[PDB]
Amino acid sequence: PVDVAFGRNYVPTWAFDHIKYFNGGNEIQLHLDKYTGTGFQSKGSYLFGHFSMQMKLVPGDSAGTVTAFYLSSQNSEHDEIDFEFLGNRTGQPYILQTNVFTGGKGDREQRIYLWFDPTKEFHYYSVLWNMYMIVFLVDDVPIRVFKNCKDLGVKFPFNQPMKIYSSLWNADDWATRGGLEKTDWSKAPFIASYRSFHIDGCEASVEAKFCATQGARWWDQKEFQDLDAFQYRRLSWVRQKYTIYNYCTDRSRYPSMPPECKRDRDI
Ligand SMILES: *[C@@H]1O[C@H](CO)[C@@H](O[C@@H]2O[C@H](CO)[C@@H](O[C@@H]3O[C@H](CO)[C@@H](O)[C@H](O)[C@@H]3O)[C@H](O)[C@H]2NC(C)=O)[C@H](O)[C@H]1NC(C)=O
């Protein structure tokens, strides 16, 4: 991933004065207070690609805040690929929640702890999205895989171009300890920081709805049909030691296991 300026790829969409630009827009901060959070979105829409952001999360007390970095399409029956960082009281750990929506249906939450303090330094958070799979990455570690299993009747984000979004907002009702820890507004502003702003994708308008170089990009090559054995072992380590909630192994909500699990090694 190569670092460009914010304004090359992104525009603010709410509370313009709550986004602070540093070094020509090579670093930005989103601020949240009791009146408003803020958010931004990509200028373009994409069908497949590699999307990456360096982020450094809200330090100190971040209880009740959610910082989200996600791709979403725009019509009804929407597709969406989500990172949501759920903050905590001081000295208590963030959760990284992921989710995938297909045809308007989500409910595929997974939640992990991280193997570093996400407030102390910038780390990469990335999505690789091709016709074969979606991989969520934290730096070079795969934390989740969602495979294209249309052959088993399961939906996959396949023909709806998506924009990239990010935002910082309060979510008192559910973010921290299921909603027990409320935001301490005397500790505002809550500040999330961003760099890199990397977009390498198939540009495909909401109107035209397709990209001319499709099937021929570097992420369409055979090396990217699956993770290799080393990447799968990293993933299983995330699964075994860092995972606190997984919809795949949740048999109370999902009596009939999600067809994708065995392929994705979420089991
Ligand atoms: C914010 O910090 C709190 C701690 O202050 C975190 O809450 C803790 O979450 C862990 C992981 O879910 C819980 O531990 C687990 O409990 C289950 C049984 O309930 C057990 O099977 C596991 O082996 C493990 O012990 C822990 O009980 C819980 N503690 C409290 C006080 O609620 C929380 O995850 C942090 N993150 C957020 C965003 O809330």
* Nearest CA residue ID for atom 9, ligand 1: 177
3 contact partners, CB below 8 Å, separation of at least 6? 26, 54, 195, 196, 197, 198
**Number of independent structural domains in the chain:** 1
255 contact partners, CB below 8 Å, separation of at least 6? none
Catalytic-role residue among 27, 77, 84, 203: 84
Concerning whether 203 is annotated as a catalytic residue, the answer is no
Find out whether the beta carbon of 182 lies less than 6 Å from any atom of ligand 1.
no
- Cα–Cα distance measured from residue 183 to residue 170, given in angstroms and rounded to the nearest whole number: 8
Concerning whether 84 is annotated as a catalytic residue, the answer is yes
Q: Provide the terminal-to-terminal Cα distance of the chain, rounded to the nearest Å.
A: 30
Q: What is the 3-state secondary structure (H, E, C) of 113-158?
A: CCCCCCCCCCEEEEEEECCCEEEEEECCEEEEEEECCHHHCCCCCC
CATH number at residue 242: 2.60.120.200
Domain containing residue 6? 1-267
* Nearest CA residue ID for atom 11, ligand 1: 244
Find out whether the beta carbon of 160 lies less than 6 Å from any atom of ligand 1.
no
- Cα–Cα distance measured from residue 19 to residue 5, given in angstroms and rounded to the nearest whole number: 14
- Cα–Cα distance measured from residue 122 to residue 101, given in angstroms and rounded to the nearest whole number: 27
* Nearest CA residue ID for atom 3, ligand 1: 92
- Cα–Cα distance measured from residue 264 to residue 243, given in angstroms and rounded to the nearest whole number: 15
- Cα–Cα distance measured from residue 132 to residue 206, given in angstroms and rounded to the nearest whole number: 22
The answer to whether 134 and 81 have CB atoms below 8 angstroms apart is yes
Pocket test for ligand 1, best of 244, 245, 246, 249 (most atoms within 8 A of CB): 244
The answer to whether 173 and 179 have CB atoms below 8 angstroms apart is yes
Which atom, in ligand 1's list, is nearest to the CA of 87?
A: 38
* Nearest CA residue ID for atom 26, ligand 1: 177
Letter string b/e over residues 69-87, b meaning 16 or more CB atoms within 10 A of that residue's CB: bbbbbeeeebbbbbbbbbb
Find out whether the beta carbon of 244 lies less than 6 Å from any atom of ligand 1.
yes
Give residue 178 CA to ligand 1 midpoint distance, Å. 10
Give residue 49 CA to ligand 1 midpoint distance, Å. 35
Which atom, in ligand 1's list, is nearest to the CA of 63?
A: 38
